[PDB]
Design a protein around this ligand. Structure first.
Ligand code: CL
Length: 293
């Protein structure tokens, strides 16, 4: 079955006075492949994808600040905080040119960094990514009232912080197949202490839905405008029914975006990595072999 282990040796780097953890496997030479997770996951989400890429390419998978095995300072964990820490993580590792593999909030980080530093990005593989959601009617009906409740300081914090609903409920409702207890324990581990759950609540409050928050909408629009014109090689994975993007819009987008290959992974919600890791990993590896890297 789908692997549950996390066999990767820990690596740590000091970033803005805090320690960040990252996976680092594969050959030391060549262009590195930088894997960026989202909410409420960690590098654990890439555990079954990396082994398809690591034979031929260096794979770097950081835990976002406040998440995974990274340090957990008392921040607001706004998108801007993650931008500051990820910018500094990339420089602290001395990365020059990279290929990005990105998901959920990791995709906002990756696309925003790529738009600002396009000379350093040699390809982008992406899935279930942050885009403007024009109205609440484009958010999946089965999850709509809860995400609306998440975006409050009263009910939303009670659910996400006090009761850990993003881990115990939303995560599982983001995967089609059932998650095992061992997998759930890996996802629970960074957030056993309720005071460490701020990122889990701030992230859904940053989602660009129905024009709010205006600053995130503007930033995401800017990187989507870039992506619609840039020649950067692109690989889009999508599933049915999806969460952040529905199938027809995914297929339409992959046709519209320059130099973009699309892969239908079959059934999927948000964490496509948990529903078809072998296809995602094998297709990333095949696509990498076509790039000038
Ligand atoms: Cl979120």
């Amino acid at each position: 079955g789908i692997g549950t282990g996390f066999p990767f040796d820990p690596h740590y780097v000091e970033v803005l006075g805090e320690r960040m953890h990252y996976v680092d496997v594969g050959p030391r030479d060549g262009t590195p492949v930088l894997f960026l997770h989202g909410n409420p996951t960690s590098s654990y989400v890439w555990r079954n994808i990396i082994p398809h890429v690591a034979p031929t390419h260096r794979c770097i998978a950081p835990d976002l600040i406040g998440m995974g095995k990274s340090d957990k300072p008392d921040l607001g964990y706004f998108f801007d905080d993650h931008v500051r820490f990820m910018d500094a993580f990339i420089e602290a590792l001395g990365l020059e040119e990279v290929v990005l593999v990105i998901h959920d909030w990791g995709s906002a980080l990756g696309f925003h960094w790529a738009k600002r530093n396009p000379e350093r990005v040699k390809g982008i593989a992406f899935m279930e990514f942050i885009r403007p959601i024009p109205t609440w009617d484009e958010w999946p009906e089965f999850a709509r009232e809860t995400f609306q409740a998440f975006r409050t300081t009263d009910v939303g914090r009670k659910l996400i912080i006090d009761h850990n609903v993003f881990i115990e409920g939303t995560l599982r409702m983001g995967v089609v197949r059932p998650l095992t207890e061992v997998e759930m324990d890996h996802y629970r581990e960074p957030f056993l202490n309720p005071v460490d759950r701020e990122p889990l609540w701030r992230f859904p409050n940053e989602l660009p839905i129905a024009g709010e928050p205006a600053n995130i909408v503007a930033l995401v629009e800017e990187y989507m405008d870039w992506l619609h014109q840039s020649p950067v090689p692109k690989l889009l994975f999508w599933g049915t029914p999806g969460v952040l993007i529905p199938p027809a819009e995914a297929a339409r987008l992959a046709k519209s975006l320059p130099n973009c290959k699309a892969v239908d992974i079959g059934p999927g919600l948000n964490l496509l990595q948990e529903d078809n890791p072998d296809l995602i990993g094998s297709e990333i590896a095949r696509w990498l072999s076509t790039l000038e890297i």
